[PDB]
């Protein structure tokens, strides 16, 4: 089995507020099929398979849990991020798959929902669905994994920025 391990470095955005509240990143939740080290593929729309002889170094929720927390760490925008505090970031992962979408070449696809909660009231600050699809350049699993690095990097960038901004607009009230 070839083992893929994407490298996700998230570039800090100059327009993200520098904050001083504290962030707990929860374990992402997901169906067992996503939360495996196996790599999902949807060769036709109603159907899931796994690439044979390919897998992920970590389960997909953990790659996602590490990207998110590492990107908060590396941002310079927030001094306090932790795993298992003022806010809690909870992610539910809906799709983590190589999606052919009736095309010749598939798209690495991540769809997920984040809630930001205010730890005190167990108060939903906001919620948002993020979908990212990045076309792969061939059908070999190596091309697919490369696309997944791109999708991971892009969704994590959208998460971090939305967490900081949403958190900060809530904190100011």
Got a strand count? Answer: 8
Class per helix and strand makeup: alpha/beta
Note the run of SSEs as H and E: EEEEHEEEEH
CATH architecture: 3-Layer(aba) Sandwich
Q: Total number of helical segments?
A: 2
Q: Helicity, in percent?
A: 25-40%
CATH class: Alpha Beta
CATH-assigned fold name: Rossmann fold
Written description of the protein model:
It is classed as structural genomics, unknown function. The entry lists the keywords Structural genomics, hypothetical protein, PSI-2, Protein Structure Initiative, New York SGX Research Center for Structural Genomics, nysgxrc, unknown function. The assembly is monomeric. The chain is an alpha/beta fold and 173 residues long. The protein has one domain: Rossmann fold (3-Layer(aba) Sandwich). Helices cover 26% and strands 34% of the residues. It contains two helices and eight strands, in the order ββββαββββα.
């Amino acid at each position: 089995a070839t083992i893929y391990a994407p490298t996700v470095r998230v570039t800090p955005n100059p327009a993200w507020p520098q904050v001083s509240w504290q962030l707990l990143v929860a374990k992402p939740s997901a169906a067992r099929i996503i939360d495996s080290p196996r790599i999902n593929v949807r060769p036709t729309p109603g159907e899931l398979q796994v690439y044979h002889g390919a897998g992920w170094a970590q389960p997909a929720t953990d790659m996602l849990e590490d990207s998110v927390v590492r990107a908060f760490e590396d941002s310079g925008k927030i001094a306090a991020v932790a795993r298992i505090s003022d806010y809690k970031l909870a992610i539910d992962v809906r799709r983590f798959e190589s999606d052919y979408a009736g095309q010749s070449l598939p798209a690495a696809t991540i769809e997920l929902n984040a809630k930001l909660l205010h730890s005190s009231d167990q108060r939903v600050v906001a919620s948002r669905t993020f979908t990212v699809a990045r076309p792969s350049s061939s059908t070999d699993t190596a091309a697919v994994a490369a696309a997944f690095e791109q999708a991971l990097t892009q969704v994590t960038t959208e998460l971090v920025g939305w967490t900081l901004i949403t958190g900060q607009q809530d904190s100011q009230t």
